Amino acid sequence: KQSHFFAHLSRLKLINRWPLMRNVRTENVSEHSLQVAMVAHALAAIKNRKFGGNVNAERIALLAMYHDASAVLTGDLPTPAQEYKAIEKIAQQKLVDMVPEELRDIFAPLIDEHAYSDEEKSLVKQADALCAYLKCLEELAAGNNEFLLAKTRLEATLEARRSQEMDYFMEIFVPSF
Amino acid sequence: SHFFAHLSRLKLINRWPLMRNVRTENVSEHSLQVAMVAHALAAIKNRKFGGNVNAERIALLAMYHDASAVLTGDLPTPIAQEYKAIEKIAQQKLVDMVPEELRDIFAPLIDEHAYSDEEKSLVKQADALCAYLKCLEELAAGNNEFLLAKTRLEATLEARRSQEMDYFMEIFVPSF
Ligand SMILES: Nc1ncnc2c1ncn2[C@H]1C[C@H](O)[C@@H](COP(=O)(O)O)O1
Ligand SMILES: Nc1ncnc2c1ncn2[C@H]1C[C@H](O)[C@@H](COP(=O)(O)O)O1
Ligand SMILES: [Co+2]
Ligand SMILES: [Co+2]
Structure with missing residues (x-):
């Protein structure tokens, strides 16, 4: 009857x-x-x-x-x-199997990474690495140099996943970090 | 932009x-x-x-x-x-921080002025449910300071009641 999903x-x-x-x-x-x-x-x-x-x-x-x-x-x-x-x-x-059946097909394609289109997949993984990068930027702004190497390798992941929308984001939203 | x-x-x-x-x-x-x-x-x-x-x-x-x-x-x-x-x-x-070229995209999200009626309703149902779920978490952990707020919000839930909420309450909530 009940779902533990939430x-x-x-x-x-x-x-x-x-x-x-x-x-x-x-x-x-x-x-x-x-x-x-x-x-x-x-x-x-x-x-x-x-x-x-x-x-x-x-x-x-x-x-x-x-x-x-x-x-x-x-x-x-x-x-x-x-x-x-x-x-x-x-x-x-x-997780997907916890959702009530009558709602399964709403949630399966949100939870299951197989369901991401090629472009959805790109955008989400670009956002993920950005956010990981921004974390390094916060930690470092606080004097914490343990995120130094993580910053550097994340710069590599970002250039690999480079796009115009990423370049806009970086030049426009990131320097304030 | 300092927005993000x-x-x-x-x-x-x-x-x-x-x-x-x-x-x-x-x-x-x-x-x-x-x-x-x-x-x-x-x-x-x-x-x-x-x-x-x-x-x-x-x-x-x-x-x-x-x-x-x-x-x-x-x-x-x-x-x-x-x-x-x-x-x-x-x-x-917050809106004036958004780059002008993108302002039309974020402004409605920030300033909430263009919510349909059903959207206002759903988001507010959800806001009160979450506040209620917090009470339930706290109370489970032995925190009696939230007992009052739990009773406040049951009234808030009653007033915003709907079939959706009733479904969520019955299906998802008691697991909390
Ligand atoms: N370079 C490096 N060192 C240590 N931990 C890291 C590094 N990069 C990301 N992470 C962490 C952040 C999360 O704890 C986990 C998965 O990050 P997610 O990006 O959400 O999959 O790995
Ligand atoms: N009954 C009661 N007592 C004390 N504090 C309360 C109560 N109900 C909600 N809140 C708090 C919870 C948040 O800190 C704030 C607004 O949250 P919002 O996102 O608008 O719910 O109000
Ligand atoms: Co992630
Ligand atoms: Co809220």
């Missing part, structure tokens, strides 16, 4: 990120996911507006809201391979 | 200040939760109750519904002009 989702704010490092301020997956949603939405809208995009930006926000949701079952694994992809995908399916 | 700079501060603004909290909730956590609950409410409406709402728009509006808090701090629900007044001021201050 009780489990409610746990996201307990799962802390960047564990291998001293954090001036602990970020949890809840804070992370909202920032990714906001950035991923901003990036989609920019693409649409200036760069010929035709992506559903509202949808992209909702995918970003959910992109790390399976952490409530697995915990957070620090980035630094095929097996983790495994558990995570098992974890995402288990 | 200032949005990243949502995580800094703490809710339920008048009270001891077993766990401190910030606006960033609340907003994600309201967005998730409000999307579900919308999708429940559409799927079970003949709704024709855009649940994704509703999620996006919910993400931004307390965004101006980063300029004002949180403002406890017990004058009501005084808070509604600072509110409009802060929203516009």
Whole structure:
């Protein structure tokens, strides 16, 4: 009768990120996911507006809201391979199976990373790395040089995932960090 | 633009200040939760109750519904002009930070002036449910300071009641 779906989702704010490092301020997956949603939405809208995009930006926000949701079952694994992809995908399916059946098909394509189109997938992973970068920028602005190397390698991930909408974002929103 | 700079501060603004909290909730956590609950409410409406709402728009509006808090701090629900007044001021201050070329995209999200009636309703249902869920968490943890607020908000839920909420309450809430 009842679904534990939201009780489990409610746990996201307990799962802390960047564990291998001293954090001036602990970020949890809840804070992370909202920032990714906001950035991923901003990036989609920019693409649409200036760069010929035709992506559903509202949808992209909702995918970003959910992109790390399976952490409530697995915990957070620090980035630094095929097996983790495994558990995570098992974890995402288990979450999906908690949703009442009559709603399953609304939630499955938000939770299950297989469902992301090529362009949705790009935008969300660009937002994710941005947000990870912005974290490094915050920590460093606080004097915390443990995020130094993480900054550098994230600069590599960003250039790999480079786009016009990312360049706009960087030049326009990031320097204030 | 300092806009995204200032949005990243949502995580800094703490809710339920008048009270001891077993766990401190910030606006960033609340907003994600309201967005998730409000999307579900919308999708429940559409799927079970003949709704024709855009649940994704509703999620996006919910993400931004307390965004101006980063300029004002949180403002406890017990004058009501005084808070509604600072509110409009802060929203516009956040709006004027957005690059002009993108302002039309973010302004409606920040200033909330163009919510349909059903969207106002859904997001507010979701905001009160989340406040209620917080009470339930706190009370489970043995925090009796939220007992009063739990009873306040049951009335708030009753007044905003709907078939969607009734579904969510029956299906998702008791697990809390
Ligand atoms: N370079 C580096 N070192 C240590 N931890 C890192 C690094 N980059 C990201 N992360 C962390 C942030 C989260 O704790 C987890 C997954 O990040 P997500 O980006 O959400 O998958 O890995
Ligand atoms: N009954 C009661 N007592 C004390 N504080 C309360 C009460 N109800 C809500 N709140 C608080 C929770 C937030 O800190 C703020 C506005 O949140 P909003 O997003 O507008 O719910 O008001
Ligand atoms: Co992430
Ligand atoms: Co709210």
